[PDB]
């Protein structure tokens, strides 16, 4: 399967969801720590890695990174959370800011199991502005993931 949309990344103790990915223009985008660059199966069925980067924690299959949109810095976004064993749910939120020395990157303060990481973050036009699942655990114990976007 290669039609556009969001996909669960599974593995067989039982069938376990290790992460989430997004398919667009024939390319499967997800996070590196999800698949560790290993090949995926889509039916019968083989997706091979094309581009990856551990620092960005991103990886593309069957082609280069296609998602180009980014957060405008003012409007609210929506996390299309696809938790393990749960139907996809759109969660609207206003992202925070991750202050680094290469600049600022948006971050959403939403908590979901580790199997949900790789789920896309959308703008008001349905464009993927980044993926969810790479972040920090703050002083209270909650999880805050950055809006990690690649380069097209």
């Amino acid at each position: 399967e290669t039609t556009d949309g969001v996909y669960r990344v599974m593995t067989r103790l039982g069938s376990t969801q290790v992460g989430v990915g997004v398919m667009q223009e024939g390319v499967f985008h997800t996070m590196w720590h999800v698949t560790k660059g290993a090949a995926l199966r889509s039916g019968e069925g083989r997706l091979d890695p094309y581009w990856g980067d551990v620092k960005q924690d991103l990886v593309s299959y069957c082609g280069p990174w296609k998602l180009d949109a980014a957060w405008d810095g003012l409007s609210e976004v929506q996390l299309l959370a696809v938790p393990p064993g749960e139907r996809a749910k759109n969660i609207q939120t206003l992202p925070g800011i991750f202050k680094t020395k290469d600049g600022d990157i948006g971050a959403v303060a939403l908590d979901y199991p580790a199997g949900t990481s790789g789920s896309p973050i959308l703008d008001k036009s349905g464009r993927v502005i980044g993926l969810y699942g790479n972040g920090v655990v703050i002083k209270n114990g909650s999880y805050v993931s950055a809006i990690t976007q690649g380069k097209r």
């Binding site: 299309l80 609207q92 800011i97 202050k99 972040g135």
Partner: protein
């Protein structure tokens, strides 16, 4: 051997639940692609 399966389309929802705050955090990213809180 990992495998993928469809979970839905990529579409914005008009009446979605709005939760979560907007924290401002100083963060440092190591070479291994992991963020830390500085």
């Amino acid at each position: 051997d990992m495998y993928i399966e469809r979970a839905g389309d990529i579409t914005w929802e008009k009446d979605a639940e709005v939760t979560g705050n907007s924290p401002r955090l100083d963060v440092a990213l190591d070479e291994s692609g992991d963020f830390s809180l500085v």
